[PDB]
């Protein structure tokens, strides 16, 4: 059908993109990837990738979205049909990300529910779930003594199993919250995306205010300086291994949400002649600034913990996804009336999480209904379809709130939508646009839309820098391979690793497969067959 919507204002676009960027990918994921790799060694690859590839590819996503009014899949039909598989990859990635991204908000909701109490559970271990090795941090400094802030997590929230092979029972208490978050999601999406006026004034400022409060409460602590010194000092020995490179490289593709159908979908709602360049750059500044600032909040608390307990900074906390839930509650414990701030912190996490969720769920739905705008037209069809996707998302996410859930969540976070797939997708996107479709032709298109050509930084970042970086990391990872491990002490069975590589391949293979499907489906000799598909069609 001819109909296609557009933004009511440029502020709608800016708000939607700002909601899509800033979320748990900055305040939760970045700290533990930095901690796992020993602090300051992580920053050099981080900024090299940032300014070499990250921002140009984000601008490419937005401007492709704006040039051709279509979602993740149906624009490559108008850039280069032969390579259309990239959109199917870009939608599989979103489908897998939405499965596991909700579980963090499930845990946040459980903490919020536990928060409303006369005394915080993780303040003192008189409770039943704790081991006899428990000692309060005030006394742990005076051989296996452990802290209550860690025991609450592991023994009550996770109820952690001794291994992935031992799933145990499903924690109904967490399952009800996992369902509640999906109810909240549905009753926002089932109408449509909108800014809704005054609600944005509160939603868009409270979380940053709370983050600033957390930063100030963090730096004030007795041991912050040692944490910062650990944070900012590169250990060059670490750069000799591929992991510190690929984790830093893929963290940026994850944070900017560029290898996903979302950003293109958001771009597609703009007017053709709209100038987006400055907004893209300033929002990239916002994203990377917030991510960088959060480190001073985390590692100051970790240095305080190491100073109080008397251990090395690298030994003090979990080298895994629990780091934020171990760190911030320990800081919340250090303020008057802890219940107030405990409430506010998890409200802040929920507000940061909901926005990103809504934006990319809407992006997935937008990218998929454009395949069948008639069969899945407006009406009851959307009502059925959205639930048909969300219910399967719920029953898939349910697999990892069991007693063995954490070992599966780690496997998802390492392989699904957060690793090599992003390098693959970004390499092929840049390769297509630069070398097949033509950098000159695309620069002329950008000139026609914006009024000014993109310039050297974008041109060479697409043509040379990004492909070379993506090839280098991809080769370096496999010539110096090392297997995955949980919390730096747990080794995965071969079947778990095989499942992880299967999960990643399910995303990667869409690119080469669709090429064969398209090519075998066209008549005539192959040299004419490829010529028909290398030309814009729709």
């Amino acid at each position: 059908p001819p109909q296609r919507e557009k933004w009511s204002s440029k502020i709608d676009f800016v708000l939607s993109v700002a909601g899509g960027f800033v979320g748990l990918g900055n305040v939760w994921r970045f700290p533990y990837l930095c901690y796992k790799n020993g602090g300051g060694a992580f920053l050099i690859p981080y900024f090299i990738f940032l300014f070499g590839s990250g921002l140009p590819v984000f601008f490419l996503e937005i401007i492709i979205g704006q040039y051709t009014s279509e979602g993740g899949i149906t624009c490559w039909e108008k850039i280069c049909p032969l390579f259309s598989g990239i959109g199917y990859a870009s939608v599989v990635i979103v489908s897998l990300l939405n499965v596991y991204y909700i579980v963090i908000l499930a845990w946040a909701t459980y903490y919020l529910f536990q928060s409303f109490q006369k005394e915080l559970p993780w303040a003192h271990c008189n409770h039943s779930w704790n081991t006899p090795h428990c000692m309060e941090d005030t006394m742990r400094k005076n051989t296996n003594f452990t802290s209550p802030v860690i025991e609450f997590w592991e023994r009550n929230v996770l109820s952690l199993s001794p291994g992935i092979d031992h799933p145990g029972s499903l924690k109904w208490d967490l399952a009800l919250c996992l369902l509640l978050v999906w109810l909240v999601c549905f009753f926002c999406i089932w109408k449509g995306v909108r800014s809704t006026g005054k609600v944005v004034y509160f939603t868009a400022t409270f979380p940053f205010a709370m983050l600033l409060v957390l930063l100030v409460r963090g730096l004030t602590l007795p041991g912050a300086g040692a944490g910062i010194k650990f944070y900012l000092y590169p250990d060059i020995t670490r750069l000799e291994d591929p992991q510190v490179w690929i984790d830093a490289g893929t963290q940026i593709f994850f944070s900017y949400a560029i290898c996903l159908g979302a950003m293109t979908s958001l771009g597609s709602y703009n007017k053709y002649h709209n100038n987006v360049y400055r907004d893209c750059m300033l929002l990239g500044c916002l994203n990377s600034g917030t991510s960088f600032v959060s480190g001073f909040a985390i590692f100051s608390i970790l240095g305080f913990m190491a100073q109080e307990q008397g251990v090395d900074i690298a030994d003090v906390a979990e080298s895994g996804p629990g780091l934020a839930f171990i760190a911030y509650p320990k800081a919340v414990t250090m303020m008057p009336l802890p219940t107030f701030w405990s409430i506010l912190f998890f409200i802040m996490l929920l507000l940061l999480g909901l926005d990103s969720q809504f934006v990319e769920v809407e992006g997935q739905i937008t990218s998929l209904v454009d395949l069948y705008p008639s069969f899945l037209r407006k009406g009851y069809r959307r009502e059925i379809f959205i639930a048909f996707v969300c219910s399967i998302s719920y029953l898939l996410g349910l697999t990892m709130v069991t007693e063995g859930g954490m070992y599966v969540f780690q496997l998802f976070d390492y392989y699904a939508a957060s690793g090599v797939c992003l390098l693959w997708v970004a390499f092929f996107e840049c390769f297509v646009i630069a070398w097949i479709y033509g950098g000159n032709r695309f620069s002329e298109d950008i000139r026609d839309m914006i009024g000014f050509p993109p310039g050297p930084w974008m041109k060479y970042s697409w043509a040379v820098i990004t492909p070379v970086l993506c090839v280098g990391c991809f080769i370096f990872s496999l010539v110096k391979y090392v297997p995955l491990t949980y919390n730096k002490t747990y080794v995965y069975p071969n079947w778990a690793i095989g499942l992880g590589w299967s999960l990643a391949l399910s995303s990667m293979l869409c690119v080469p497969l669709v090429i064969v499907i398209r090519l075998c489906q066209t008549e005539g000799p192959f040299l004419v067959r490829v010529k028909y598909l290398l030309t814009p069609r729709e």
Partner: antibody, heavy 118, light 107 residues
Framework: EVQLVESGGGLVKPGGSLKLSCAAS????????MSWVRQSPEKRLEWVAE????????YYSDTVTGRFTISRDNARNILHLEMSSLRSEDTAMYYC????????????WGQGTTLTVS | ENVLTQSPAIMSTSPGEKVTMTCRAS???????LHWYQQKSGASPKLWIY???NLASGVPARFSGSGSGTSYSLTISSVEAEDAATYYC?????????FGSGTKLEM
């Protein structure tokens, strides 16, 4: 450094046809977008047409959209304008302008050539 | 077609004063898409001001512009000899491109 010089122009019968050209030097002519602008004997400026770097995108003024054609010769750094039916209102001096970036205007102009109709 | 109207038909000035030229649009135009040009009598124009206040490569820097939305202006801090010319305001946000009626400074 940069140079622009138009050629062609003269007396023609009303309803006749004439072809103007604009040679360029001193810059990578394949990159910069080009436009034509004409000045009436009343000294009023009027925009005519624009053509993009690769000639893929072309725009026309409303009062000439049916009679004028704009084209390029990138291999020899020459710009062409072809007119099909010159009414009495078409007499003017035609300028050749290198307006690449829309946020920065027409930074270079040619000398221009006159066109008149009997 | 977004027509631009310039207020003063013509100006004559002694070399001891400052003046302002007004350019008014039929529809609002962004600040990044209005430029002013110089035309010396008997010669082809040249770019004078762009993006509503940025000064061209050789303009005497006594020139400055200000405005937004529907109305714009060009101002001269101090007029002087050899400043005589015809100045046009031009819209560049959308097609067709339009030039103002232009105004001439003499005397």
């Amino acid at each position: 450094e940069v140079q622009l010089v138009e050629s062609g122009g003269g007396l023609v019968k009303p309803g006749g046809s004439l072809k103007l050209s604009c040679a360029a030097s001193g810059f990578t002519f394949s990159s910069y977008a080009m436009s034509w602008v004409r000045q009436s004997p009343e000294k009023r400026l009027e925009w005519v047409a624009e053509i993009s770097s690769g000639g893929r995108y072309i725009y026309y003024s409303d009062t000439v959209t049916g009679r004028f054609t704009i084209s390029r010769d990138n291999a020899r750094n020459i710009l062409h304008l072809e007119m099909s039916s010159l009414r009495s209102e078409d007499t003017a001096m035609y300028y050749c302008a290198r307006g690449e970036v829309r946020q920065r205007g027409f930074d270079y102009w040619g000398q221009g050539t006159t066109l008149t109709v009997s | 077609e977004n027509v631009l109207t310039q207020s003063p038909a013509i100006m004559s000035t002694s070399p001891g004063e400052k003046v302002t030229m007004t350019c008014r649009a039929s529809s609002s135009v962004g600040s990044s898409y209005l430029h002013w040009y110089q035309q010396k009598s008997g010669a082809s124009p040249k770019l004078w001001i762009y993006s509503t206040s940025n000064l061209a490569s050789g303009v005497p820097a006594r020139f400055s512009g200000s405005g937004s939305g529907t109305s714009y202006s060009l101002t001269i801090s101090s007029v002087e000899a050899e400043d005589a010319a015809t100045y046009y305001c031009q819209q560049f946000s959308g097609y067709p491109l339009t030039f103002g009626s232009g105004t001439k400074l003499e005397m």
